[PDB]
Amino acid sequence: YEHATTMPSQAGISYNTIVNRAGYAPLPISITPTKIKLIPTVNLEYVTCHYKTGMDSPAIKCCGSQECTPTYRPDEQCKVFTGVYPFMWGGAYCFCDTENTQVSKAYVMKSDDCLADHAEAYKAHTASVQAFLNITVGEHSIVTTVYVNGETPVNFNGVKITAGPLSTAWTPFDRKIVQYAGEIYNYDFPEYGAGQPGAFGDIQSRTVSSSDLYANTNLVLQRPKAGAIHVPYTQAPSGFEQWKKDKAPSLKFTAPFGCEIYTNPIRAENCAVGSIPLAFDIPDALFTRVSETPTLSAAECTLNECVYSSDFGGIATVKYSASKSGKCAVHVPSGTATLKEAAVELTEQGSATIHFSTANIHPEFRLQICTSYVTCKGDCHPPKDHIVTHPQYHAQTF
Amino acid sequence: TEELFNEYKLTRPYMARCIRCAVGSCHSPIAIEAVKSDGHDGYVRLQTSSQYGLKGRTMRYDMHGTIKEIPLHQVSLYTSRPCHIVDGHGYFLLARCPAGDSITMEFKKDSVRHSCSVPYEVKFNPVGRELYTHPPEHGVEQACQVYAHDAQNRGAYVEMHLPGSEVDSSLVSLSGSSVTVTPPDGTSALVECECGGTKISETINKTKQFSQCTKKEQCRAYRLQNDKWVYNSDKLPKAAGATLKGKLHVPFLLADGKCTVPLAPEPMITFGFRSVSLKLHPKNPTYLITRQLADEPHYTHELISEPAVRNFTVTEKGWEFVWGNHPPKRFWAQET
Amino acid sequence: KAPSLKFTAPFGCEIYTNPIRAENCAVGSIPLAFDIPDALFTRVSETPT
């Protein structure tokens, strides 16, 4: 048997319903989502980190000339100058006065700290949604992970539940993301091969251990000071460090809908947007005959206490007269009031107490008891606390 | 190689029921467990009861509790025409012979023929799109799946348990007036029955005469085997104990190798204005696939075993086909 | 078993095994853009006119 239902996407708050066959006792269903995660299609593109100015020993030739040999290291710069008069601790390295030549060749290499400190680039799109559900259909309670796309049902006791796709394809992430130290930021980094000096992406590497890197640090060699063997070099500061000092606030606190971010793998969860539809396929063996369940007669409502707060604040005493003692489900067909419990145990000639939540000053709602209906009515009082520490359990009717 | 033979050295031979040993239902040491036929060139693997290779090429089989052996070149199997034995190790055999409907294997040690026939299909699979019945003398090379000739420790394993307490009506004998149980040399056994009260006794290489139960047909002396093992097969009872105690790996696992496959005759082509006619003279039934090089394929597939003439229309976008195992041929026309 | 995509696919795309992929079939047009440095250019007068 095919049944359709809808669920506002939000964890914690439970959901109660009864499927009512025209000639058999209603079958109860309870649903509780635990975690609703949303994982994107994310493909890694590159990685960056601190760089280190690789500088060999200066190549000095004394009264002669030299040439440049390109090692083809990334962003290599080579230069030769004349008219050098170097010194050493033990006097003069040379005796020549002029014609001396010195050659400098400089480059960049990845810092030793690349493994533990490195910012990753990511291209995100195509969010897929997963969920953990705690569902009980006909006192068959289960906790299970389910693919809530438009296929992939999960079956237990013959009951086949299918959670359809979301009504909204919104995602908190932008197309290009940057990851670092477990924090996530939506940033527009320049793409591979187009890095610029003094900004993010000056040094470029396909992977952590690619061993082939592109670089634009704009390294410039300079004439060393006279009477000293050394090589002065000038370059823009680390754009990674400039971005480190800039660091706009994190997505964990900037995202709308209050979406929390964890990255063991990149994912976002526990934030309410849209609705998830549920499709039940129930086998015909789970339906029980009416005579095998208690049936009531002359049942009446009374409203004992009212507080139309966020939490359940309506207490109702229902007085009944039963042919049998046995548990049955109680349901409110409309959204006027939402009950707290999925089932209530029932004596022969006792009275039942029911907790519910409503936002109506003058509620008048029809409850469905084991096989009959009763019409509870009354007025209700405002709350006392201005703010609470939990969300709303009910809807806001117009 | 003994490192791998010692695994199957210490298990057993065993006997089992047979549908036909040339005389009705029967009990034979030549029961066939199951047949698997997935190899391309017709290589088949058989799982018999008697084990092989234990000595270079010899068979060893049980007979009413006693072991015997025979050289391998005296046992023969067939489906429709005589088959051929390549190699045998442990419980398994590798054979090669064409398709059929049943597997019938037999031998003749004394002047009495032992046989079993079973209805398990064997299927000959042609490699490629050019079907045949016997691989050709010449052709081209392709990668198919054949069962490797080597016996090496792979990851595939089979299960093995302790033997059941098989009965033997021969041991119980009649004295002047009594029933005597005479276990063979150095073997243990267990005698059961209810002729008076209830009796379940054990014997360890001792002959026992029972004063009561002074007749033949009543009751039973089961054997005991401890240092030997059996395969988990439906034709043996399971003794007490749900233990498993070990498993063994299988030889002749499927492998990948180069494979000879036939080549079809070169088609005779005749051209026309946006049309091409094909003359075809297959030696054996062959496939044809033809498709256009446009967004609509209109793919057309045929099996042909007789000569015929087939005309096709080719547009500017292009035509393509394969006839048999030849490389694809693409034809592209122009304005004339 | 049905005919393969390498024998019935449109546009004659050839499919290989190791990465699931297709090659050598014509569809559409690739736009290309070039940023050429001035170093490779030559003066008109230095070329025959």
Partner: nanobody, 122 residues
């Protein structure tokens, strides 16, 4: 992205015994297949070893001499290579197929490392 790193090889005399190792790095949790392929100069690519879980498979020209072991926990394969002949010189590549990304953005199926050179001297 997922990659394969190959280590081992070198120049040795005939009759020696070496080990070739290939390791997988990236966003992967389980691997269905890992195999070895050899490419000699002037010829085409051919398979040598074939390992996936407990099962193994060997070619015709490599039986009884080379052994393949796989560690899915480390996602590595070790080809213990013995009884060298002059025909064994080639560049060896390690391949991985049927990759199950840990959701794990689905991506390319197969990968190919740079490989290692093995040369044998008579």
């Amino acid at each position: 992205e997922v990659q394969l790193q190959a280590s081992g090889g070198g120049l040795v005399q005939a009759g020696g015994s070496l080990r070739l190792s290939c390791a997988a790095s990236g966003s992967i949790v389980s691997i269905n297949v890992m195999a070895w392929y050899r490419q000699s100069p002037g010829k085409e690519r051919e398979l040598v070893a074939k390992s996936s879980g407990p099962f193994t498979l060997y070619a015709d020209s490599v039986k009884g001499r080379f052994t393949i072991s796989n560690d899915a926990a480390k996602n590595t394969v070790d080809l213990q290579m013995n009884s060298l002949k002059p025909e064994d010189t080639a560049v060896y590549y390690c391949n991985a197929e049927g990759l199950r990304y840990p959701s794990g953005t689905y991506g390319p199926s197969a990968v190919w490392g740079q490989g290692t050179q093995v040369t044998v001297s008579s």
